[PDB]
């Protein structure tokens, strides 16, 4: 009923903000993290549509929020525009990246109360959400979105900070990257408008090959894998090895010249930096998040290459639902909902009491 | 659908301590 006794979810991406309303299955509310201001203010879909009198920003980076000014303008566009609710009504669960430095989750418990005037709160782990929204509290989290990837393991619903793996390459760099080789094949994509055409081609066509080599082989014996799409003009462009070259940079980061280890790599590096005792455990519970997760064939990839990877007689099971683009949202929406979760919230009395620092004892 | 809210609590009501964890080295702060 969205009253007093229902809590909002508000997952603060680089590229997408996500909010809701705990208990519901599927956010209220998917907009564009960004804040548009006079050129020489405006929230997500409206400051896009007024781009031509604005200039745009991202106020968060690879997943950790940097411009404060601007992130309390997308928090006060998403409670009274987007979900219209009073936010001194409801607890808050926000989210934030793994390893969100101490000063920076501080300041959002400051905000969220002295801004905001919320009776509760509470400041989760994306990778950790998207674990519990597949009812488990053990395995390791690939979590890839549009401006960063981690790789979090979580034991009994803690994180383990030693072990995560954080990697700039991410879906933003992805549709960069296939500007770059769509422009090798004839079709010029460089302006901001551009980018968003690459990310409908990217997220529309792309797709994870289960064998680089024998798919590269595949493209060019025939125009099997070849796709049309009609661009806003009306021009029609071909694609083809582009549609699976570009995300095998996920496992192959020397395609943009990073010298980092691909994601199943990544994986076994984390598996490998915690105890032997719980390795089963890990293996066996792979759960893949996030929009840059949602490429056919990336499940079965990563099965391969972690198969790979581990002892032979391993059982490995990747999770990886249809869900997965919002399940750091939907695990928010799961657990702020809980019962037993609501002795969790920082409350509004605590944090008068203690100030900021009280979500180092209250939120992990 | 709801499955997942009953495996959740009832996980978390059955974790083991931080102070285990960091007994068995799974956590590992230092
Ligand atoms: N079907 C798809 N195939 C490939 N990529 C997709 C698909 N759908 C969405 N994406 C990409 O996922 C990204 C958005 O995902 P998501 O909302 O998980 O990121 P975010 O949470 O805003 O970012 P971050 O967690 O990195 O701060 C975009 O780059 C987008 O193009
Ligand atoms: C359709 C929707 C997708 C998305 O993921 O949008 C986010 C946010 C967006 C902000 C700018 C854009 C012009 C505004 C609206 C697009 C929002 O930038 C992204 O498209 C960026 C640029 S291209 C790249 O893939 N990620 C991702
Ligand atoms: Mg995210």
């Known amino acids: 009923d969205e009253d007093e006794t229902t809590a909002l979810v508000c997952d603060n991406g680089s590229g997408l903000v996500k909010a809701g309303f705990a208990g519901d299955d599927a956010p209220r509310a998917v907009f564009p993290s960004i804040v548009g201001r006079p050129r020489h203010s405006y929230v997500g879909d409206e400051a896009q549509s007024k781009r031509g009198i604005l200039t745009l920003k991202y106020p968060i980076e690879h997943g950790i929020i940097t411009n404060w000014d601007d992130m309390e303008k997308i928090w006060h566009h998403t409670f009274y525009n987007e979900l219209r609710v009073a936010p001194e009504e409801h607890p808050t669960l926000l989210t934030e990246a793994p390893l969100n430095p101490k000063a920076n989750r501080e300041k959002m418990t400051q905000i969220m109360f002295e801004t905001f005037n919320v009776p509760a709160m509470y400041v989760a782990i994306q990778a950790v959400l998207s674990l519990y929204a597949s009812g488990r509290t053990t395995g390791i989290v690939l979590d890839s979105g549009d401006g960063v990837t981690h790789n979090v393991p979580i034991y009994e619903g803690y994180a383990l900070p030693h072990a995560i793996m954080r990697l700039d390459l991410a879906g933003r760099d992805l549709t960069d990257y296939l500007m770059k080789i769509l422009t090798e094949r004839g079709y010029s994509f460089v302006t901001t408008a551009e980018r968003e055409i690459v990310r409908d081609i990217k997220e529309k066509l792309c797709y994870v090959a289960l064998d680089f080599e024998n798919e590269m082989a595949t493209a060019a014996s025939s125009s099997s894998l070849e796709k049309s799409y009609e661009l806003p003009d009306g021009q029609v462009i071909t694609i083809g090895n582009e549609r699976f070259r570009c995300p095998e940079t996920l496992f192959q980061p020397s395609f943009i010249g990073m010298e980092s280890a691909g994601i199943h790599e990544t994986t076994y590096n984390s598996i490998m930096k915690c105890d032997i005792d719980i390795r089963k455990d890990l293996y066996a519970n792979n759960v893949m998040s996030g929009g840059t997760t949602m490429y056919p064939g990336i499940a079965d990839r990563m099965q391969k290459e972690i198969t790979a990877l581990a002892p032979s007689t391993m059982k490995i099971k990747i999770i990886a639902p249809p869900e997965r683009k919002y399940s750091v949202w939907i695990g928010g929406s799961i657990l702020a909902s809980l019962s037993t979760f609501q002795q969790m919230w920082i409350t509004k009395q605590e944090y008068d009491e203690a100030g900021p620092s009280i979500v180092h004892r209250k939120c992990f | ?30």
């Open chain 2, 1 to 30: 659908k709801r499955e997942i809210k009953r495996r959740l609590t009832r996980k978390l009501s059955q974790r083991p301590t931080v102070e285990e964890l960091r007994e068995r080295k799974i956590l590992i702060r230092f």
